[PDB]
Homo-oligomer: A and B are copies of this chain.
Amino acid sequence: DKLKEAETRAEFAERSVTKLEKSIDDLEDELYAQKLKYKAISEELDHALNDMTSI
């Protein structure tokens, strides 16, 4: 009986780890996408703040 319980929970803990590992890779990837989509708008920015201080 201790067994059915230990095994059933091992299976649930493994299903939850694969679920959370799958959600960590999607957030970490959505990420370098966000972190990069920015260097571009922050750099378009030092530029688009410098020309109106000049005009």
What is A's interface to B at a CB cutoff of 8 Å? Answer: 2-3, 6-7, 9-10, 13-14, 16-17, 20-21, 23-24, 27-28, 31, 34-35, 38, 41-42, 44-45, 48-49, 51-52, 55
Chain A binding surface SS class: helix
Residues of B within 8 A of A44 (CB): 45
Oligomeric state, in number of copies?
A: 2
The chain B residue sitting closest to A51, CB to CB, is B52
A31 engages B27 (CB within 8 Å): yes
Closest residue of B by beta carbon distance from A17: B17
Q: Can you list 26 A-B contacts with CB-CB less than 8 angstroms, sorted by A residue number? A: A2-B3, A3-B6, A6-B6, A6-B10, A10-B10, A10-B13, A17-B17, A20-B24, A24-B24, A24-B27, A27-B27, A27-B31, A34-B35, A34-B38, A38-B38, A41-B41, A41-B42, A44-B45, A45-B45, A45-B48, A48-B48, A48-B49, A48-B52, A52-B52, A52-B55, A55-B55
